[PDB]
Design a protein around this ligand. Structure first.
Ligand code: FAD
Ligand code: FAD
Ligand code: FK1
Ligand code: FK1
Lengths: 411, 411
């Protein structure tokens, strides 16, 4: 009946709003005001594919569906090693159903407002152990949904599920107005720069209206690990254009007139992919359950964290409702996570962690073959809505050849 | 707009009813009358877990929810090698949400009636190539949902996805009244007889009311491959009791007064697990798409075929609706299957095919440990609602030990 959530983010607010609609009392702790979120720095590029969007629709939370531009496909390009300014791989495929990117600076504050209107108890505090000890005495279940916040480290890192202990990419975001729209359909335009990094770009909705989000990922120490000397929004926009001019001149043609959406429409950072154990034990001996990025944190290279957050909150909501009047004990907590991990997130995580490493030959062959086998390009693109569908053919050479043949037979 | 389906079974009727509700015209071919199905031989033990049941509920097709007894857990027993009449493993765990078994002799005819009432065009014919050639000219998509019927062999067997080319178990069913109900909760009572076979029993609903279904699976050539000399319903009931008396005397105690529900409440047969390619090309060059057991046929040992059929028809329905006015071409057909297979059925199939082979030591250790680690028994039982959750720990020794420890830590 009474549920506490620490962290008013994507997963926490989605879960809390779903619980309020199911008749629960919900207490939520936020460490920021809605307006400070709206006007602060961007946090994500939040490209959500149709399955995730549908979870929001089923809860009545798709408040920006008509205003947010759709992302209608996925494109992949690789620079040509010899031919200057050209591409050796350049293909695209349409998504079976649109994706959408609604700036968390819009969504989270609006969902905070809705949470209050629907009877939630919003408490404004940077929560720590004392708040978790208090919550665990007055609530039937307490979840930690604090994303990358320091309190997420209460949960023990799971070494076996975490192959990396260091960041594998240097990240940056740039929200811009003025970019030439993609024709004849919008897409996530992926640009893979061998041994250097990746640039992704797609339309989105932010606090000043429709835009495009530039996403940069650089191999640490390399030419796209280039944000440390950037100290002003103007320097950040300049650096963004320098990457395109240097590595993706075909995308620079779309950017002759770009401007930041706002001075806080920029981000630079990095983190190590990490999986954690879901049950944390407080000094009192009482227990809390971690949600979404607290327990499974992937590098953004595959565009999956928000998708994972919506699917994780959906799985946890269903588990809570199915438990009914039963106690939310450690066993129940652990099984709830296990269903998320073994059923889904282990495959998103293995796929993303593989793609962070240098691509093996059979992967380069897949990417080339997709350009000449449209069913394979379509399988690649739509796999982003459910990355389980990449296994076993993406990771294994022999299986990749079998799947290429399957796709070729229906081309 | 116009869809044809050959085979009025679980998957075909579920899909057809979902398409009619979405505004499509649907033509369906049945090779039997509803009454001949109601009064004919049983076809399945159709134990459906909550995710599958929920697919039926979301379509308004759970017409027997209140009359059908619930199956509330899963139990596992193994005879003791030394101690006579005793068990060395004997444990149970509650399902997070109930399962239900509604005799296909009840469900399929009732869904056939509903299909007509909702505007479907039901055509009564044993359909063959000529009907598929006619359908493919007058309909936008033609699916074959004929289960184990001979026409299913139009689709090419997929050797790489089919490790077996012979039956791995001799099957039998016995629907009975009078069995002592299980206390204190109902369950699928699994009995694993090392090197011989398996006996499963659980409550269900049939045409004469609530019953229990006895399910026998025998290693070919062994003592539970014992149905060839059975030629009358009385001999079939006697043989059923002989198995329990010989191998599971603890279950015989529940059966002192059992009687067949009806003389057609019996079945004996066998088949080779088979996966097929989903697109078949007719002599004209036009194409048809296989559904459910036509393309993925598993031995019943894991209780998954009906569950797969409901999840396959749900995936195909969603794919059709998402395709909208687009052509149902071979590429679309193949991608629809690929999403079912790579996303879900490959894992159900790998798990079931492993369990048909002799269990390795780490599996026997898992089964024993589940009896002393209740979180592990619960993970095992609830894995039947989504067998993806068994990977990778069920199939690998080191991973199994890790998961045992995870479960032990929350016990
Ligand atoms: C650069 C970048 C690009 C990305 N691009 C994409 C993309 O294109 N597609 C995609 O799907 N995902 C993407 N992601 C991932 C996605 O943004 C996250 O995975 C998602 O926000 C996770 O949701 P969450 O609920 O777990 O955490 P969050 O949404 O981060 O919410 C956690 C909240 O808790 C707050 N909090 C922290 N500590 C406390 C405390 N002690 N008390 C109270 N509140 C606290 C935090 O400030 C935050 O507001 C990207 C991530 C990054 C960094
Ligand atoms: C002994 C046994 C026990 C089982 N126990 C379980 C269990 O406990 N749980 C579980 O989930 N699953 C179980 N299954 C599996 C389950 O019964 C099937 O997987 C499920 O019925 C498959 O659905 P379907 O739509 O593909 O085919 P079906 O439901 O078999 O439908 C196919 C229909 O098409 C008809 N047909 C065939 N040829 C033609 C033609 N040319 N023209 C017209 N119609 C035609 C067939 O007669 C049939 O009516 C069991 C199966 C067996 C054999
Ligand atoms: Br597809 C896709 C969508 C968004 C992002 C952000 C980084 N990589 C991505 C891939
Ligand atoms: Br669990 C379960 C449920 C039904 C059947 C039928 C054969 N084996 C089964 C396992």
């Amino acid at each position: 009946k009474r549920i506490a959530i620490v962290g008013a983010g994507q997963s926490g607010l989605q879960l809390g709003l779903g619980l309020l609609a199911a008749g629960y009392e919900v207490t939520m702790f936020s460490n920021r005001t809605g307006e400070d979120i709206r006007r602060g720095k961007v946090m994500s590029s939040q490209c959500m594919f149709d399955t995730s969007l549908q979870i929001e629709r089923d809860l009545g939370l798709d408040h920006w569906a008509s205003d947010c531009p759709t992302v209608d496909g996925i494109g992949l390009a690789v620079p040509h090693p010899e031919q200057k300014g050209a591409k050796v791989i350049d293909w695209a495929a349409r998504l079976n159903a649109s994706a959408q990117s609604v700036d968390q600076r819009l969504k989270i504050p609006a969902w905070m407002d809705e949470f209050q209107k629907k009877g939630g108890e919003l408490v404004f505090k940077d929560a720590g152990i004392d708040e978790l000890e208090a919550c665990t005495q007055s609530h039937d279940l307490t979840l930690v949904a604090s994303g990358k916040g320091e309190i997420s480290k209460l949960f023990e890192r799971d070494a076996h599920k975490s192959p990396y202990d260091k960041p594998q990419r240097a990240l940056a975001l740039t929200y811009v107005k003025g970019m030439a729209p993609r024709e004849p359909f919008s897409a996530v335009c992926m640009n893979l720069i061998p041994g250097v990094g990746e640039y992704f770009v797609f339309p989105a909705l932010t606090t000043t209206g429709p835009c495009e989000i530039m996403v940069f990922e650089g191999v640490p120490g390399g030419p796209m690990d280039c944000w440390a000397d950037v100290k002003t929004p103007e320097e950040h926009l300049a650096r963004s254009k320098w990457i395109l001019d240097t590595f993706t001149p075909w995308e620079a043609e779309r950017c002759k007139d770009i401007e930041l959406t706002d001075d806080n429409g920029i981000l630079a950072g990095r983190f190590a992919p990490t999986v954690r154990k879901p049950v944390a034990t407080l000094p009192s001996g009482r227990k809390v359950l971690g949600l979404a990025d607290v327990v499974v944190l992937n590098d953004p290279i595959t565009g999956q964290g928000s998708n994972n957050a919506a699917k994780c909150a959906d799985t946890y909501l269903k588990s809570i409702l199915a438990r009914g009047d039963g106690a939310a004990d450690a066993a129940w907590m652990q099984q709830t996570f296990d269903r998320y991990w073994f059923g889904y997130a282990q495959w998103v995580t293995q796929w993303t962690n593989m793609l962070l490493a240098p691509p093996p030959p059979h992967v380069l062959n897949l990417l080339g073959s997709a350009g000449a086998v449209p069913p394979l390009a379509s399988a690649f693109a739509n796999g982003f809505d459910d990355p389980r569908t990449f296994f076993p053919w993406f990771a294994d050479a022999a299986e990749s050849e079998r799947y290429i043949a399957t796709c070729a037979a229906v081309a």
